[PDB]
Amino acid sequence: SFSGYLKLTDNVYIKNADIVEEAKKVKPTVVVNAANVYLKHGGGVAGALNKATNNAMQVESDDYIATNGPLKVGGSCVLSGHNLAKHCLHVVGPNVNKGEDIQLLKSAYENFNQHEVLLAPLLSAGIFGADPIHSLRVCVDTVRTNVYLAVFDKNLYDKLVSSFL
Numbered sequence: 001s002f003s004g005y006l007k008l009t010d011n012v013y014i015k016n017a018d019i020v021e022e023a024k025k026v027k028p029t030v031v032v033n034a035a036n037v038y039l040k041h042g043g044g045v046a047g048a049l050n051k052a053t054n055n056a057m058q059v060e061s062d063d064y065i066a067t068n069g070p071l072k073v074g075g076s077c078v079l080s081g082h083n084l085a086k087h088c089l090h091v092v093g094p095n096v097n098k099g100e101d102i103q104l105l106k107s108a109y110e111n112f113n114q115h116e117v118l119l120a121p122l123l124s125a126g127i128f129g130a131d132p133i134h135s136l137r138v139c140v141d142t143v144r145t146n147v148y149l150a151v152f153d154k155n156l157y158d159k160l161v162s163s164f165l
């Protein structure tokens with residue numbers, strides 16, 4: 001199971017780790033992808049998870065979009081986890097850099113409540129432009145199921161833990 005995580009709350013845990021490496025080792029039931037509405041996994045967590053699947057995640061995602069159209073900002077879909085997890089929950093947090101509404105971050109985290117345990121990144125953090133301290137706050141105040149957060153950046157991880165209320 002998950003190892004080396006620091007307990008933040010009754011249901012939220014955190015570790016300084018690359019979510020790709022965490023997924024390959026743990027093979028959780030659900031890994032969350034920091035997706036965009038088009039499921040175009042170019043960079044950030046999405047690009048890294050997709051590269052770990054040898055692009056199988058992108059091929060599956062393009063078929064999903066061809067059939068269903070784009071997701072909503074704040075929405076999600078469940079697809080295969082390929083070699084990383086049983087499932088991948090592709091969640092679209094608002095991209096602040098694209099002028100998307102930050103208030104949609106709570107809606108994005110609500111998707112996690114449909115899964116009893118998840119390996120996840122902080123939504124809307126990184127290249128999505130939101131303040132990761134705010135993302136962690138919304139996570140702890142929204143998600144009720146067991147969430148194991150992987151924070152890639154060591155310095156951000158230390159700031160997140162040391163500043164956690």
Ligand SMILES: COc1ccc(NC(=O)Nc2ccncc2)cc1
Pocket residue numbers: 018019020044045048051121126152
């Ligand atoms: C062998 O090629 C590799 C390429 C990329 C990664 N990981 C990576 O970029 N992870 C990431 C985590 C959080 N935010 C953004 C990115 C690992 C191996």
